[PDB]
Paper text:
ER activates transcription in response to estradiol (E2), and a wide cast of other estrogenic compounds, including steroids, phytoestrogens, and environmental estrogens, by either direct binding to DNA, or tethering to DNA-bound transcription factors. Upon agonist binding, the ERα LBD undergoes a conformational change that allows helix 12 to dock across helix 11 and helix 3, thereby forming a coactivator-binding surface called activation function 2 (AF2). Thus the AF2 surface represents a nexus for ligand-mediated control of both recruitment of coregulators to the LBD and allosteric signaling to other domains.
The crystal structure of the ERα LBD in complex with an A-CD ring estrogen, which has the typical phenolic A-ring but like resveratrol, does not have an adjacent B-ring, showed the same space group and crystal packing as the resveratrol-bound ERα structure. This was therefore used as a control agonist structure. Compared to the typical phenolic A-ring of the A-CD ring estrogen, the resorcinol group of resveratrol induced a shift in helix 3 via a hydrogen bond with the backbone of Leu387. Leu693 of the SRC2 peptide binds helix 3 between Val355 and Ile358, and is shifted by 1.6 Å in the resveratrol-bound structure, inducing an overall rotation of the peptide. Here, the coactivator peptide participates in crystal packing, but the crystals are in the same space group and show the same crystal packing interactions. In contrast, the A-CD ring estrogen and E2 had similar effects on coactivator peptide recruitment to, or dismissal from the ERα LBD, consistent with a fully functional AF2 surface.
Author numbering:
A (entry chain C): 687 to 698
B (entry chain A): 305 to 358, 360 to 461, 467 to 548
C (entry chain B): 305 to 461, 470 to 548
D (entry chain D): 688 to 696
Write the structure that this text describes.
């Protein structure tokens, strides 16, 4: 969904 | 959680180590600014900073939250976070805003964009305040974490999470106080300084709300192509 | 300055004594609400409250020491924050409702009458719940309201230092109150921070409310009093 | 300005 969602899950 | 088991010194270390990198602007300093040019640089910078801000995951206690709650806090606080970062690094540049090491803008360059000098003046005023208080790096990282956890905490079967966030917030308060005690401040001076720092967060909220409205107006006017990420962050406030 | 020589207990007394009365709205129970009539009620109320607020500010220690231009600025900056913290305070003992006036107690469903207002009601109600959870005391409330007056417009400005000395005094007062109430040293700084962080949320609600009020004005939904028009104007 | 006048009366 949200780009933010994707960024959070992919955080490094 | 581990966040609550951290000593004050361990909290400061964790926050210091979690600090995002200082990015450069694509700025080419052989070309005068235009309204579009200026907005482009600032928004491009903000978009790249946002990715790195998502730092958030390393803020003690944050990783404990649901993906939903993390999204909410970031959507609420992202511009406040960018702004306090900007004010912090501009501290030793009176009258200027250090957006990046290669993009140092004075007040009058705010006029390059309609309605922006008003925003610049507020950021500059906050910077002067930080300078006046001699704000320390250890205190800054504490304040920025408080913003992340506080700004959207009241916009929430899941009362256990909100209480966890409040326990983490209390720990950060303990950490600020610890730094002030270590710095040799008396009890009265500790409480006074703590109050002073937190009141600045009121002004940072104000600047964010104003900046959000300005960023929105520039969007509608199509005076600048905003990234998909930036548009979604902006959309969350409207 | 007399304000700085005030003890904590004298500070609290002065602030408690300067508290404005709870005013009634012009609510007419013979008629159903419309977007226009509800906006009329709330804005008529805010207007009468403003008059009392102006006179309350004159009694906040240190305020009258400022130039008229500075007093004007602080109030222009903080007026809606001040109205909102008052509303949240008197709504404390009414879970799920905002006690705008004794004869005007509204839940979020009644907020829906006005386009976009339920969002504001929700934020106010959330803040009210927070006060209730913290068991906010009246002495703490009056300190917080005075801090808002002095702080909100202080950075958009010697006198600056004077305002900060006064603000420091209010901090000392808050700590004094908490100690007197039996809070431990650690609990004192923790509660101080919790209370002050609320002010960030109050600022947020004021900015959102200001945009909404301006919106209603620009759609000719409700006529605002000349005073309210000028207070609103100061934010643009 | 009305506010300015009121802060005196
Ligand atoms: C481009 C704007 C000016 C500052 C900008 C910003 C960018 C990067 C930062 O690290 C801080 C701030 C955000 C927006 C907010 C208002 C204006 O549109
Ligand atoms: C009419 C509005 C609803 C709350 C209202 C208010 C009135 C009196 C109070 O004591 C507090 C608040 C002010 C405006 C702010 C947004 C909206 O337009």
């Amino acid at each position: 969904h949200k780009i933010l969602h994707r960024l959070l899950q992919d955080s490094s | 959680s581990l966040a609550l088991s951290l000593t004050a010194d361990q909290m400061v270390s964790a926050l210091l180590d979690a600090e995002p990198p200082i990015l450069y602007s694509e700025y080419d300093p052989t070309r005068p600014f235009s309204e579009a040019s200026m907005m482009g640089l600032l928004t491009n910078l903000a978009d790249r900073e946002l990715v790195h801000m998502i730092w958030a995951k390393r803020v003690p206690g944050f990783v404990d939250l649901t993906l939903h709650d993390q999204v909410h806090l970031l959507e609420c606080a992202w511009l406040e976070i960018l702004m306090i970062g900007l004010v912090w690094r501009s501290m030793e540049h009176p009258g200027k805003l250090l957006f990046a090491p290669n993009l140092l803008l004075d007040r009058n360059q705010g006029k390059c964009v309609e309605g922006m000098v008003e925003i610049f003046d507020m950021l500059l005023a906050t910077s002067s305040r930080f300078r006046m208080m001699n704000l320390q790096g250890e205190e800054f990282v504490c304040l920025k974490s408080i913003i992340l956890l506080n700004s959207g905490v009241y916009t929430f079967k899941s009362l256990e999470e909100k209480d966890h966030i409040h326990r983490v917030l209390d720990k950060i308060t303990d950490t600020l106080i610890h730094l002030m005690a270590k710095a040799g401040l008396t009890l009265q001076q500790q409480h006074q300084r703590l109050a002073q720092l937190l009141l600045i967060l009121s002004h940072i909220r104000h600047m964010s709300n104003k900046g959000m409205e300005h960023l929105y107006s520039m969007k509608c006017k199509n005076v600048v192509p905003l990234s998909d990420l930036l548009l979604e962050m902006l959309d969350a406030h409207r």
